[PDB]
Short mmCIF file of C-alpha atoms and ligand atoms in Angstrom, two decimals:
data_model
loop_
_atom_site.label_atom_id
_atom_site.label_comp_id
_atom_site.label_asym_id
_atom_site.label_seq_id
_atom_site.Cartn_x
_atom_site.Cartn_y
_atom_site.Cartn_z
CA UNK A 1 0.00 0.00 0.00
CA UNK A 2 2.70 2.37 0.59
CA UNK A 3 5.04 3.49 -0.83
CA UNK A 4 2.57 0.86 -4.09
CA UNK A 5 5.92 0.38 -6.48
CA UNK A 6 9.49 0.61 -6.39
CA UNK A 7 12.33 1.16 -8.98
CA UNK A 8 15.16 -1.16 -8.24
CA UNK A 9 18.18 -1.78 -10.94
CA UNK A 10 16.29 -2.81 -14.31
CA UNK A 11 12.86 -3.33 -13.04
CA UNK A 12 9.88 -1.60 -11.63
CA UNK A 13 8.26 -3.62 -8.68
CA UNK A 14 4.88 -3.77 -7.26
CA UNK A 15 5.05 -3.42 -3.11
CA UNK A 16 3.10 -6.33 -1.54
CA UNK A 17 3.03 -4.65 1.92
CA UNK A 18 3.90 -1.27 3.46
CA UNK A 19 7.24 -0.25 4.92
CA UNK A 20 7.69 2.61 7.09
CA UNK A 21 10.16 4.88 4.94
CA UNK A 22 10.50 8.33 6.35
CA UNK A 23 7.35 10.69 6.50
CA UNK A 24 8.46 12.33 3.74
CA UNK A 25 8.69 9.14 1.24
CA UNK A 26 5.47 7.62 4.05
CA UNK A 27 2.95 9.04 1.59
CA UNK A 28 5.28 8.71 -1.58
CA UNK A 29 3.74 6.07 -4.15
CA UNK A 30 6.27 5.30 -6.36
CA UNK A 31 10.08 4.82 -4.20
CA UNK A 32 13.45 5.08 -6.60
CA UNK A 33 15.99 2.94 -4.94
CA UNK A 34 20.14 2.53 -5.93
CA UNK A 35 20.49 -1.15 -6.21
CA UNK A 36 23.54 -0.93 -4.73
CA UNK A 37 23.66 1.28 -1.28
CA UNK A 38 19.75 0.89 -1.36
CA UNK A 39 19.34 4.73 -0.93
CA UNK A 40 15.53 5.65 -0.77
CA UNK A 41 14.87 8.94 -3.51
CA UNK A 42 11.69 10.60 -5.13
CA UNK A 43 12.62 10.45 -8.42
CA UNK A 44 14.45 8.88 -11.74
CA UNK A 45 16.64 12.16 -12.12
CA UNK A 46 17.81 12.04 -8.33
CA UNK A 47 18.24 8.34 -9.03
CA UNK A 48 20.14 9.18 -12.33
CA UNK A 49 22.43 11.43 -10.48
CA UNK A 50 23.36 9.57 -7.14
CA UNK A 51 23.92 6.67 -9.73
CA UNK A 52 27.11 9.12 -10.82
CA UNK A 53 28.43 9.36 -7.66
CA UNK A 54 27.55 6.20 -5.86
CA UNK A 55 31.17 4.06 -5.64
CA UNK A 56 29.77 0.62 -4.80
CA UNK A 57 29.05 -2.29 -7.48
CA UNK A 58 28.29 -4.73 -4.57
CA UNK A 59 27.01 -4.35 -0.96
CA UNK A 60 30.14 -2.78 1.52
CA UNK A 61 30.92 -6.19 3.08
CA UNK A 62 32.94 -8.91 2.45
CA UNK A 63 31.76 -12.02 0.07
CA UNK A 64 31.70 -14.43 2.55
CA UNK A 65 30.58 -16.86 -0.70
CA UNK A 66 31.71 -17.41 -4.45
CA UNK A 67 30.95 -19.67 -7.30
CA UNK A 68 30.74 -18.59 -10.61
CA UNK A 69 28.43 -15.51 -11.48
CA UNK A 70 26.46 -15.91 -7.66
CA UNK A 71 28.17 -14.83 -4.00
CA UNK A 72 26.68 -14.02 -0.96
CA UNK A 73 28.14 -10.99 1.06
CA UNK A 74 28.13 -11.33 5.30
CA UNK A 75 27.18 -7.70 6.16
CA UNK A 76 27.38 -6.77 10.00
CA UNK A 77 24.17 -4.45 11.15
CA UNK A 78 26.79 -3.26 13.62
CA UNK A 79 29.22 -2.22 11.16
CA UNK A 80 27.04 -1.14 7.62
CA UNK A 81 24.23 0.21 9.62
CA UNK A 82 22.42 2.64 7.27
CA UNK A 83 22.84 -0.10 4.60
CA UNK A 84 21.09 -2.64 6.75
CA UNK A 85 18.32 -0.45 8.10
CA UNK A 86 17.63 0.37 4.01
CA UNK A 87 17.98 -3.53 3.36
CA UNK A 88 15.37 -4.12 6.20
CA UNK A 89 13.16 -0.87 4.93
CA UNK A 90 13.01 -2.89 1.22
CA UNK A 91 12.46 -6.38 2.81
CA UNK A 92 9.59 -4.88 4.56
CA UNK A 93 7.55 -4.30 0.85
CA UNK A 94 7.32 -8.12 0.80
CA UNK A 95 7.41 -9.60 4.58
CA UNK A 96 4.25 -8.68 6.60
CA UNK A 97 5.93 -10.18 9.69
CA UNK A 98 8.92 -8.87 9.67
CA UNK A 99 8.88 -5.86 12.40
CA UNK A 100 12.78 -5.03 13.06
CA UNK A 101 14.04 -2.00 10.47
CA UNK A 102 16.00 -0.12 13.31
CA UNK A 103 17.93 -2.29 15.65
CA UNK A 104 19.98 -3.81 13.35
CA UNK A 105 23.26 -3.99 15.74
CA UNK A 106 22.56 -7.15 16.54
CA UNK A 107 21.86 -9.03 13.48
CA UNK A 108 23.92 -10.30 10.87
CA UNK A 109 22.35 -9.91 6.42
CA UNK A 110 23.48 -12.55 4.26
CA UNK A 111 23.29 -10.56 0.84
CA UNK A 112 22.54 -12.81 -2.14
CA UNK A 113 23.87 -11.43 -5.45
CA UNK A 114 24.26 -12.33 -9.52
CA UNK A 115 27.05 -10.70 -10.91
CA UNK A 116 27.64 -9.28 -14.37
CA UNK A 117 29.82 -6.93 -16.06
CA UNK A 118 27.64 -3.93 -14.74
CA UNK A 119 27.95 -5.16 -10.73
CA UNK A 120 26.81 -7.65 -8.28
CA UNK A 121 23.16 -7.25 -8.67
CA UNK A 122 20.89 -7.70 -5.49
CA UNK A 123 18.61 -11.02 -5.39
CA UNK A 124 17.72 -11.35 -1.57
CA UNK A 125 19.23 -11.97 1.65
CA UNK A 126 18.70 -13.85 5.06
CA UNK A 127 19.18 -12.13 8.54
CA UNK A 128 20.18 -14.03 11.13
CA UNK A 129 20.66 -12.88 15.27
CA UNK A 130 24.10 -13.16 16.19
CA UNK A 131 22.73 -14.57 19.52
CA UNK A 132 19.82 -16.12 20.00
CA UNK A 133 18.86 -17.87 22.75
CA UNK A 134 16.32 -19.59 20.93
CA UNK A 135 18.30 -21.18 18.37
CA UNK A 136 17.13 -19.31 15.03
CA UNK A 137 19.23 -20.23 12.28
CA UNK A 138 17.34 -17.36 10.24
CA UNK A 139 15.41 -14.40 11.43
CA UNK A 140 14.14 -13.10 7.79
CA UNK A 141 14.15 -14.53 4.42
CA UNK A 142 13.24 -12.82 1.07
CA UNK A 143 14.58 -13.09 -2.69
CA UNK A 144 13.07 -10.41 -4.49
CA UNK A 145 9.68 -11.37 -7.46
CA UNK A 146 11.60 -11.31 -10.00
CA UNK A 147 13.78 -13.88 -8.93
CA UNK A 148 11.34 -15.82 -7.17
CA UNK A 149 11.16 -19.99 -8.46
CA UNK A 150 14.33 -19.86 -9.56
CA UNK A 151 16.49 -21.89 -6.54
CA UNK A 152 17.67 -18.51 -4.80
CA UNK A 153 15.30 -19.35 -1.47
CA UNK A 154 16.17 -22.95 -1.20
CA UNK A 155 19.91 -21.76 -1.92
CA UNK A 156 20.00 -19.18 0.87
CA UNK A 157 17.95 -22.12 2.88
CA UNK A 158 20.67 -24.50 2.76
CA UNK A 159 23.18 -21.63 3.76
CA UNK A 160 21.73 -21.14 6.33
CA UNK A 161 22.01 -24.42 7.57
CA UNK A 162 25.34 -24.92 6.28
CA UNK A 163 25.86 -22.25 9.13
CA UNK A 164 24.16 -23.24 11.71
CA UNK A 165 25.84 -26.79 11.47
CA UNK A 166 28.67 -26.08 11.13
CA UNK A 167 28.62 -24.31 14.91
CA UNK A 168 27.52 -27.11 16.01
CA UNK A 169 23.57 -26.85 16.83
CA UNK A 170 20.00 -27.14 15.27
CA UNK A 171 18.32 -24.13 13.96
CA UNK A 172 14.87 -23.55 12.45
CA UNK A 173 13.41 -20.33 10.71
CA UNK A 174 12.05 -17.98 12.88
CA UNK A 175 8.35 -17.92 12.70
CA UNK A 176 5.91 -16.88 11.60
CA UNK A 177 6.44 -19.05 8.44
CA UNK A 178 4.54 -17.10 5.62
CA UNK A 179 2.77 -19.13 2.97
CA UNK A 180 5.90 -18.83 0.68
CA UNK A 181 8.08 -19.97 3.57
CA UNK A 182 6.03 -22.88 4.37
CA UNK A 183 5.95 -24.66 0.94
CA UNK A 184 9.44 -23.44 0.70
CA UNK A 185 10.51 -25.07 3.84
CA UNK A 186 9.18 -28.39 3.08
CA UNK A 187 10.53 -28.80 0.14
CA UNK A 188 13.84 -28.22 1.29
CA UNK A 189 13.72 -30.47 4.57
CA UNK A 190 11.91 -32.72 1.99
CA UNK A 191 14.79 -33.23 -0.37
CA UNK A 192 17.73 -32.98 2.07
CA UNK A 193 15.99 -35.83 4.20
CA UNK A 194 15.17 -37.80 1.08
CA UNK A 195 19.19 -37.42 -0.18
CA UNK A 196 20.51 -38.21 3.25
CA UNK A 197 18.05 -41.19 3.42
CA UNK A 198 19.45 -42.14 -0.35
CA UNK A 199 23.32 -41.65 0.86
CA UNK A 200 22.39 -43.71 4.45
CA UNK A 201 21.22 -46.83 3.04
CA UNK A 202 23.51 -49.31 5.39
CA UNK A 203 22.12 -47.05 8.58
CA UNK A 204 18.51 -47.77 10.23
CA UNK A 205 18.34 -43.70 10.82
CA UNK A 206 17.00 -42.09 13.89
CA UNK A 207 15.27 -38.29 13.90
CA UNK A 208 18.17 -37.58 16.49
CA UNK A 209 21.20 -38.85 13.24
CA UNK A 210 18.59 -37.30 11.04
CA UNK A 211 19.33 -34.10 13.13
CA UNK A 212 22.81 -34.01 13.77
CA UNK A 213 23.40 -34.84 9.78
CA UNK A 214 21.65 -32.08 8.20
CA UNK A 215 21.59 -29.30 11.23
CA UNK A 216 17.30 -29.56 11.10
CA UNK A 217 15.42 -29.69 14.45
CA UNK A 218 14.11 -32.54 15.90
CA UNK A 219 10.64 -31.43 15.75
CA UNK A 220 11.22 -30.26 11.57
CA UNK A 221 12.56 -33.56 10.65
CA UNK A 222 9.41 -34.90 12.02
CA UNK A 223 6.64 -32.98 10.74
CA UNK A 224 8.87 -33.68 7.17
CA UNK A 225 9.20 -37.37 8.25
CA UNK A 226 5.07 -37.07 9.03
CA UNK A 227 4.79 -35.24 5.34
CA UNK A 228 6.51 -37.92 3.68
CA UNK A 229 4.53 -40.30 4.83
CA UNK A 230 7.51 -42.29 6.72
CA UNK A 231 6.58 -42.36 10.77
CA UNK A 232 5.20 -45.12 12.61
CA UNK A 233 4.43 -45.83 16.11
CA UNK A 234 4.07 -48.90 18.02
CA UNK A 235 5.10 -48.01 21.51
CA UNK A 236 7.30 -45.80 23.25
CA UNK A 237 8.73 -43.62 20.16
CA UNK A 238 8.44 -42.72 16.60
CA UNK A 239 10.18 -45.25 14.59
CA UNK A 240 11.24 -44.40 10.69
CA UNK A 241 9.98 -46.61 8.00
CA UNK A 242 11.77 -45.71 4.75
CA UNK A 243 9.42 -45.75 1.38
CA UNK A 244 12.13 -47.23 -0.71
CA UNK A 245 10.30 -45.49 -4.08
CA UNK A 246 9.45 -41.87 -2.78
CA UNK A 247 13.65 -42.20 -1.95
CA UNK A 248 14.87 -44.01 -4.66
CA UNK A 249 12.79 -41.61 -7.03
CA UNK A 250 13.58 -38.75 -5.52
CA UNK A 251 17.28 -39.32 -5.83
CA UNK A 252 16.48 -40.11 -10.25
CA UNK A 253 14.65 -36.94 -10.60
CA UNK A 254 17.55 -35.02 -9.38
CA UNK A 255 19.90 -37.08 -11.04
CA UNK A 256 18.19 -35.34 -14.58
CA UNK A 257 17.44 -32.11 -13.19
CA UNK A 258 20.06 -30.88 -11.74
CA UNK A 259 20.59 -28.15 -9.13
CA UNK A 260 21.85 -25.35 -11.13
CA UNK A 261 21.77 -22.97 -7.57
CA UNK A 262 23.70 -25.26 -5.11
CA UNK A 263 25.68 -24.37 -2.06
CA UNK A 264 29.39 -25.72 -2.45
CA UNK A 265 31.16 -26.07 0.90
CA UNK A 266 34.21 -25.62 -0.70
CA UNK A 267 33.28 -22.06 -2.11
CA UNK A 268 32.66 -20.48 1.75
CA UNK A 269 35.45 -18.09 2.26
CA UNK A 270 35.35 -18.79 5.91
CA UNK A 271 33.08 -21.39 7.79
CA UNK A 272 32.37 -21.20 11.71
CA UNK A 273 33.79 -23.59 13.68
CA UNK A 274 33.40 -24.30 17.84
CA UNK A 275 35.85 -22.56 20.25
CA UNK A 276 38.14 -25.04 22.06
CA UNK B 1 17.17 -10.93 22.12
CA UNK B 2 14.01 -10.60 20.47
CA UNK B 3 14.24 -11.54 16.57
CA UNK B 4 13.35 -9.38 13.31
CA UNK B 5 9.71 -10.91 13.99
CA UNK B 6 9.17 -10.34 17.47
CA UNK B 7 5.75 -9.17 17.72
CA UNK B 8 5.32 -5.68 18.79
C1 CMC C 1 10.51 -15.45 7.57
O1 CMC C 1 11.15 -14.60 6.97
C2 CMC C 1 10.44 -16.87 7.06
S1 CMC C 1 8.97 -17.19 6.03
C3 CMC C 1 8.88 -15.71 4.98
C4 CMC C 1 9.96 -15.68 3.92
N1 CMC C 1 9.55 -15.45 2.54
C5 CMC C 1 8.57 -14.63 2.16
O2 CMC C 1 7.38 -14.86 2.35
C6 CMC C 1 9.00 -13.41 1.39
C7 CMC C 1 8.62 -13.50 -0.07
N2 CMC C 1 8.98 -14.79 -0.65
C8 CMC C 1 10.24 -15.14 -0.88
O3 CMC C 1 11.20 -14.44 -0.61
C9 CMC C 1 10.45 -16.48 -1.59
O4 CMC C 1 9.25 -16.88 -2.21
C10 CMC C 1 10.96 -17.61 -0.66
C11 CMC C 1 12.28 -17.19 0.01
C12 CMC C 1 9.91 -17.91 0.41
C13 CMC C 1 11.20 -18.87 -1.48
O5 CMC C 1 12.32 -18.68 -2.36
P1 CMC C 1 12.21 -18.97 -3.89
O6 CMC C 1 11.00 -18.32 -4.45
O7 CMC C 1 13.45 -18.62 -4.56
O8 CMC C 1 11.99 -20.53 -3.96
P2 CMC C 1 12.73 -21.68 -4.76
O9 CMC C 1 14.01 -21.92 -4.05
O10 CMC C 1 12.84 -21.37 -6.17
O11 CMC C 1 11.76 -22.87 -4.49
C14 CMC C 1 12.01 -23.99 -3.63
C15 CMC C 1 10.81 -24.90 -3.65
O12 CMC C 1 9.75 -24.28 -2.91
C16 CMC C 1 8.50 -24.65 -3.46
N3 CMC C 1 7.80 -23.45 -3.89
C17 CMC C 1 8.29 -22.17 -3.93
N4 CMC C 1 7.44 -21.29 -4.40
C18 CMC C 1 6.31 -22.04 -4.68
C19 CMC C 1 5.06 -21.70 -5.22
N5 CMC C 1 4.71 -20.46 -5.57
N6 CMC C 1 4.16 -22.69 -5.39
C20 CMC C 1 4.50 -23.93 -5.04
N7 CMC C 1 5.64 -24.37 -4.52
C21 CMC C 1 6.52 -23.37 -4.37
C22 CMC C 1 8.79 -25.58 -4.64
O13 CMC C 1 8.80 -26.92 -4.17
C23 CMC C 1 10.18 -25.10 -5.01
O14 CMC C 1 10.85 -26.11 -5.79
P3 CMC C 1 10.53 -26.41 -7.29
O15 CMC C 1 11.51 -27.46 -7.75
O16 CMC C 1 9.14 -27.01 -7.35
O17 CMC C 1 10.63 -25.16 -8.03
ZN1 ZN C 2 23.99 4.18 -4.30
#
């Protein structure tokens, strides 16, 4: 509702929810954003003319993440602070939920980009708490329409557990999940439970190897384990019965499509690790 | 702390 539509590199954007830009862009309809600092302006020739001066071809942080044209960027709140309370004032157009724009000190934006010869050209991002005492491996998640369906969200998904693994503990998204999240969730727990299943076939699996494995909750794995049609009960616990053809399929349709948009361990710059 | 969801 407002500000309705956005400019934003080569493409004009419809808003699907309002974002509290400053009272002076508040009752602005149209918003004209650098895709690169993510500077709010009211119109194409300001936007023309901060695009002359702006320095920046990628977001001011380190790439934390690189494989050929796609790297993610690991920007501090604490450290690019206007940046990240712009980042949180765009991701607000398309997450009803999301309610923190200010206090961005504590977080940490994993910036997802697709670089050409004119820059590193924003596609979404993932916030994440620095410390959270409930265990979120992801406080905000959101690739931008015209990217949408294309692998970006399960990409940035499995990031984020690729994190959150490897310090150690189980994370899950921090909810609520919208409808986009939920179908998008799924499908990832889905196909990394139906892959691990594939690549654990001398194991009887447990939820709890399950969990340590992939970095998913307890309680994910089985709602996905309930999904898939794979839980039983008899007596005292849940036990796993494997549907040899929902694996074994699974595992051939990937095998032909392929994942164009995968996360390669080997292309993280740096990877957490615990503390002795 | 209180995430980027937190209800307020
Ligand atoms: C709090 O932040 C967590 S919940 C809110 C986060 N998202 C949100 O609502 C903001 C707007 N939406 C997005 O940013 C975006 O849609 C995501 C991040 C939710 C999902 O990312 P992608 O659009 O890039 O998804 P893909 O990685 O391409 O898809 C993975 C699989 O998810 C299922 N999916 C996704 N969109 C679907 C629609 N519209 N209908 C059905 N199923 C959908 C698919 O299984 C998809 O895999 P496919 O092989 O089928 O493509
Ligand atoms: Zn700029």
């Amino acid at each position: 509702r407002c500000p309705s539509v956005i400019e934003f590199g080569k493409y004009e954007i419809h808003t699907w929810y309002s974002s509290p830009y400053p009272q002076e862009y508040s009752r602005l309809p149209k918003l004209y954003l650098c895709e690169f600092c993510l500077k709010y302006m009211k119109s194409r020739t300001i936007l023309q003319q901060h695009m002359k001066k702006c320095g920046w071809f990628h977001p001011p942080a380190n790439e934390i993440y690189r494989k050929n044209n796609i790297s993610v960027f690991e920007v501090d709140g604490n450290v690019s602070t206007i940046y990240c309370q712009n980042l949180c004032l765009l991701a607000k157009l398309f997450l009803d939920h999301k309610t923190l724009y200010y206090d961005v000190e504590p977080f940490l934006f994993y910036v997802l980009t697709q670089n050409d010869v004119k820059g590193c050209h924003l596609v979404g991002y993932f916030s994440k708490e620095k410390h959270c005492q409930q265990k979120y491996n992801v406080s905000c998640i959101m690739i931008l329409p015209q990217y949408q369906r294309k692998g970006y969200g399960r990409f940035l998904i499995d990031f984020s557990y690729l994190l959150s693994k490897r310090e150690g503990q189980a994370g899950s998204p921090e909810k609520p999940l919208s409808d986009l999240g939920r179908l998008s969730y799924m499908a990832y727990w889905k196909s990394v439970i139906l892959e691990c299943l594939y690549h654990q076939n001398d194991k009887q699996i447990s939820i709890k190897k399950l969990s340590k494995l992939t970095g998913i909750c307890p309680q994910d794995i089985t709602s996905t384990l309930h999904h898939l049609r794979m839980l039983d009960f008899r007596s005292d616990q849940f036990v796993i019965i494997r549907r040899e053809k929902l694996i074994q399929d699974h595992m051939a349709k990937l095998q032909l499509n392929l994942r164009p948009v995968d996360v390669d361990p080997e292309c993280l710059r740096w990877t957490p690790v615990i503390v002795s | 702390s209180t995430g980027g969801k937190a209800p307020r």
